[PDB]
């Protein structure tokens with residue numbers, strides 16, 4: 776699709792068999808989801824945003840369907856204010872900025 | 875232009891008479907610029923993201939040029955680590971997400 780920006784670019788994603796709402800976030804390097812359970816191994820990591828640093832759980836090679844487009848990649852789980860889809864997965868679904 | 879997301883979508887902006895590099899950020903409701911001493915009235919505000927909140931100064935009707943496209947609107951000034959062009963101005967320069 777083409778998505779304008781008068782409203783937040785929220786989309787439905789499917790991950791671990793669950794539907795969630797997430798924000799397409801070109802300013803995010805990484806994909807960060809609010810607390811949830813995901814299967815398999817994870818690694819403790821830290822990431823920084825506008826307000827400082829948080830601790831997250833890093834899950835690798837996780838499938839995630841974003842507005843019907845398939846990605847498989849790294850998902851960070853932790854105290855983000857909202858679910859954000861970052862550039863690591865935006866690139867996988869072929870997302871560009873255009874003006 | 876078309877900006878892919880392999881790297882951070884940094885572009886040149888001009889505000890006041892300073893040229894700066896800023897992220898075209900679909901995840902940002904508002905535009906947030908690194909500390910700079912702008913003239914005019916402003917209101918205090920707190921904006922939240924990963925890590926918590928930062929205190930910013932809200933300036934209204936500030937002209938900014940973003941890769942040659944003119945925009946004018948609200949700019950938040952505070953201790954952000956990166957200059958952020960948010961949706962308030964992204965719509966003004968005709969910016970869409972496409973996949």
Ligand SMILES: CC[C@H](C)CN(C[C@@H](O)[C@H](Cc1ccccc1)NC(=O)O[C@H]1CO[C@H]2OCC[C@H]21)S(=O)(=O)c1ccc2ncsc2c1
Pocket residue numbers: 800801802803804805806807822823824825826856857859861899901902903904905906921922923924955956958960
């Ligand atoms: C609430 C939704 C997100 C988290 C909001 N953030 C914009 C976001 O694009 C931010 C923009 C950003 C970029 C770089 C540093 C700080 C902020 N990126 C970010 O935190 O990304 C993190 C995940 O990937 C990592 O890569 C970059 C930092 C990490 S923000 O910077 O905190 C932000 C910006 C404008 C704004 N206007 C009103 S509230 C508000 C909050």
